[PDB]
Design a protein around this motif. Structure first.
Motif, PDB file in Angstrom:
ATOM      1  N   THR B  10       0.870  -1.170   0.000  1.00  7.46           N
ATOM      2  CA  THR B  10       0.000   0.000   0.000  1.00  7.46           C
ATOM      3  C   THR B  10       0.895   1.203   0.000  1.00  7.46           C
ATOM      4  O   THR B  10       2.032   1.089   0.442  1.00  7.46           O
ATOM      5  CB  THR B  10      -0.892   0.088   1.242  1.00  7.46           C
ATOM      6  OG1 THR B  10      -0.071   0.287   2.400  1.00  7.46           O
ATOM      7  CG2 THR B  10      -1.687  -1.179   1.425  1.00  7.46           C
ATOM      8  N   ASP B  11       0.399   2.353  -0.428  1.00 10.89           N
ATOM      9  CA  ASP B  11       1.211   3.558  -0.355  1.00 10.89           C
ATOM     10  C   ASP B  11       1.434   3.999   1.068  1.00 10.89           C
ATOM     11  O   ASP B  11       0.598   3.770   1.945  1.00 10.89           O
ATOM     12  CB  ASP B  11       0.610   4.733  -1.125  1.00 10.89           C
ATOM     13  CG  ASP B  11       0.799   4.660  -2.628  1.00 10.89           C
ATOM     14  OD1 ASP B  11       1.552   3.829  -3.082  1.00 10.89           O
ATOM     15  OD2 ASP B  11       0.221   5.475  -3.313  1.00 10.89           O
ATOM     16  N   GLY B  12       2.565   4.646   1.286  1.00  8.71           N
ATOM     17  CA  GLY B  12       2.895   5.192   2.587  1.00  8.71           C
ATOM     18  C   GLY B  12       2.378   6.618   2.687  1.00  8.71           C
ATOM     19  O   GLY B  12       1.216   6.894   2.387  1.00  8.71           O
ATOM     20  N   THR B  13       3.233   7.519   3.136  1.00 11.22           N
ATOM     21  CA  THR B  13       2.878   8.920   3.303  1.00 11.22           C
ATOM     22  C   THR B  13       3.931   9.752   2.624  1.00 11.22           C
ATOM     23  O   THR B  13       4.861   9.215   2.042  1.00 11.22           O
ATOM     24  CB  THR B  13       2.800   9.316   4.788  1.00 11.22           C
ATOM     25  OG1 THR B  13       4.113   9.253   5.357  1.00 11.22           O
ATOM     26  CG2 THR B  13       1.876   8.384   5.554  1.00 11.22           C
ATOM     27  N   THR B  14       3.798  11.057   2.662  1.00  7.58           N
ATOM     28  CA  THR B  14       4.892  11.847   2.145  1.00  7.58           C
ATOM     29  C   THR B  14       5.255  12.843   3.216  1.00  7.58           C
ATOM     30  O   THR B  14       4.468  13.776   3.350  1.00  7.58           O
ATOM     31  CB  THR B  14       4.532  12.552   0.821  1.00  7.58           C
ATOM     32  OG1 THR B  14       3.460  13.469   1.033  1.00  7.58           O
ATOM     33  CG2 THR B  14       4.118  11.542  -0.235  1.00  7.58           C
ATOM     34  N   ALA B  24       9.854  10.952  -3.815  1.00 11.65           N
ATOM     35  CA  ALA B  24       8.817  10.033  -3.396  1.00 11.65           C
ATOM     36  C   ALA B  24       8.082   9.542  -4.605  1.00 11.65           C
ATOM     37  O   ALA B  24       8.190  10.129  -5.678  1.00 11.65           O
ATOM     38  CB  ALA B  24       7.849  10.691  -2.436  1.00 11.65           C
ATOM     39  N   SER B  26       4.153   8.031  -5.856  1.00  8.45           N
ATOM     40  CA  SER B  26       2.787   7.698  -5.501  1.00  8.45           C
ATOM     41  C   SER B  26       2.284   6.516  -6.315  1.00  8.45           C
ATOM     42  O   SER B  26       2.786   6.257  -7.400  1.00  8.45           O
ATOM     43  CB  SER B  26       1.916   8.924  -5.704  1.00  8.45           C
ATOM     44  OG  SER B  26       1.891   9.339  -7.050  1.00  8.45           O
ATOM     45  N   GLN B  27       1.313   5.784  -5.777  1.00 10.79           N
ATOM     46  CA  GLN B  27       0.684   4.656  -6.458  1.00 10.79           C
ATOM     47  C   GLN B  27       1.709   3.557  -6.737  1.00 10.79           C
ATOM     48  O   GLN B  27       2.647   3.343  -5.962  1.00 10.79           O
ATOM     49  CB  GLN B  27      -0.032   5.100  -7.750  1.00 10.79           C
ATOM     50  CG  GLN B  27      -1.220   6.010  -7.545  1.00 10.79           C
ATOM     51  CD  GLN B  27      -0.824   7.446  -7.440  1.00 10.79           C
ATOM     52  OE1 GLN B  27       0.070   7.894  -8.167  1.00 10.79           O
ATOM     53  NE2 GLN B  27      -1.474   8.187  -6.553  1.00 10.79           N
ATOM     54  N   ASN B  28       1.531   2.871  -7.863  1.00 10.07           N
ATOM     55  CA  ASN B  28       2.442   1.847  -8.288  1.00 10.07           C
ATOM     56  C   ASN B  28       3.631   2.478  -8.966  1.00 10.07           C
ATOM     57  O   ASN B  28       3.562   3.593  -9.494  1.00 10.07           O
ATOM     58  CB  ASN B  28       1.748   0.856  -9.207  1.00 10.07           C
ATOM     59  CG  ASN B  28       2.537  -0.414  -9.421  1.00 10.07           C
ATOM     60  OD1 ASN B  28       3.556  -0.653  -8.763  1.00 10.07           O
ATOM     61  ND2 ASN B  28       2.089  -1.229 -10.341  1.00 10.07           N
ATOM     62  N   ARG B  44      11.483   1.274  -3.784  1.00  8.05           N
ATOM     63  CA  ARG B  44      10.745   2.513  -3.567  1.00  8.05           C
ATOM     64  C   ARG B  44      11.560   3.438  -2.671  1.00  8.05           C
ATOM     65  O   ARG B  44      11.049   4.423  -2.137  1.00  8.05           O
ATOM     66  CB  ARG B  44       9.373   2.249  -2.970  1.00  8.05           C
ATOM     67  CG  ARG B  44       8.435   1.500  -3.900  1.00  8.05           C
ATOM     68  CD  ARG B  44       7.159   1.131  -3.247  1.00  8.05           C
ATOM     69  NE  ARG B  44       6.240   2.240  -3.035  1.00  8.05           N
ATOM     70  CZ  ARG B  44       5.273   2.618  -3.900  1.00  8.05           C
ATOM     71  NH1 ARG B  44       5.114   2.013  -5.057  1.00  8.05           N
ATOM     72  NH2 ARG B  44       4.440   3.596  -3.587  1.00  8.05           N
TER      73      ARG B  44
END
Lengths: 50, 251, 50
Positions: B10-14, B24, B26-28, B44
């Motif tokens: 799953t995505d983390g945060t920024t 960073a 986002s997504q895949n 990643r």
């Protein structure tokens, strides 16, 4: 000085690294050049990227 | 019972960072990395830094790859193989002017009958004195002086002159002429290949000076409203920057 | 001056950007031109939008 002028005593040299970022921390606030940092590039304030 | 281990991407945060090339994602999507032994890996790990070899790496230590750039200015070969991204600290070569643009707006009612001599000084013989800076083969600057001389309605004579060098003798001949329609729209004399003059062996390039969309109108003062020097002088790598489209650029 | 006149020494140039708004803050009260700002347009006081 008293002879009514300004003379050059010297020029402070500044150093930039490839990575600045990669330096080895030492002493007080001293860094040693490292292979990671690459070799320092010398220049003057307001020249190039100094 | 037997176990089967999985991992949920799953995505983390920024995270409001700002040092290095903290990119960073986002997504895949994974960054494509190459191990020094010629092996491809994915990650990643947004932490990137320039090493002493001028290569982008993680830590880890693996090489960040991407598409190679080519041409001058460089272009991205998207169809090319994912080459290792490097960032040289060496100089942008000067690039001669190849073309130039010059949008001119002239007052329809500004004639030159006061005088006929030129020599870049007889003010009365012209209506507008504009100068376009151009670069020769070593990037040496040249002074493209351009004179606009209203000969009549919708016809202006153009004189040119490189004041950066002695070679630019008195510009007493009509380098070209511009023709406008009744609406003040430049109909002809669109562009002229004009020499740059020469310095220190640098060749006198010559370049296509376009007056495209120039106009002759009732109002305003003879003026220049945007001009372009298609070329560069020498350059030094001031900074690094990454755009959200993944382009890595040099400032 | 003493020769009973006024002569032109020069003309201060003014610059407008596409965005003025977008400039990169520097020094004392200095701004650097940016892509966001676009390229400066030069002119004189009381002309165009200056």
């Amino acid at each position: 000085y008293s002879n009514e002028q300004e003379q050059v005593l010297g020029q402070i040299v500044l150093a930039n690294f490839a990575n600045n970022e990669g330096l080895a921390s030492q002493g007080d606030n001293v860094w040693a050049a490292t292979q990671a940092s690459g070799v320092a590039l010398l220049g003057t304030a307001g020249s190039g990227n100094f | 019972k037997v176990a089967g281990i999985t991992q949920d991407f799953t995505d983390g945060t920024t995270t409001n960072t700002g040092r290095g090339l903290d990119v960073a994602i986002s997504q895949n999507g994974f960054f494509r990395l190459v191990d020094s032994n010629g092996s491809v890996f994915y990650s990643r790990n947004g932490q990137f830094k320039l090493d002493e070899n001028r290569n982008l790496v993680n830590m880890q230590g693996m090489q960040l790859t991407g598409y190679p750039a080519t041409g001058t200015p460089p272009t991205i070969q998207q169809g090319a193989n994912p080459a290792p991204i490097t960032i040289p600290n060496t100089l942008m070569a000067a690039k001669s002017t190849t073309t130039a643009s010059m949008q001119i707006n002239l007052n329809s009612t500004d004639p030159v009958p006061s005088k006929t001599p030129f020599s870049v000084s007889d003010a009365d013989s012209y209506n507008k004195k504009g100068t376009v800076t151009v670069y020769d083969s070593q990037g040496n600057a040249h002074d493209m002086n351009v004179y606009f001389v209203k000969t009549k309605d919708n016809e202006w004579a153009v004189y040119t002159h490189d004041s950066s060098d002695p070679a630019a003798t008195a510009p007493t001949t009509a380098s070209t002429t511009l023709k406008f329609n009744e609406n003040g729209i430049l109909e002809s004399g669109g562009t002229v290949n004009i020499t740059t003059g020469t310095i220190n062996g640098a060749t006198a390039a010559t370049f296509s000076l376009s007056f495209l969309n120039s106009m002759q109108q009732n109002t305003g003062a003879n003026n220049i409203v945007a001009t372009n020097q298609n070329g560069y002088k020498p350059g030094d790598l001031v900074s690094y920057q990454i755009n959200n489209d993944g382009t890595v650029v040099g400032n």
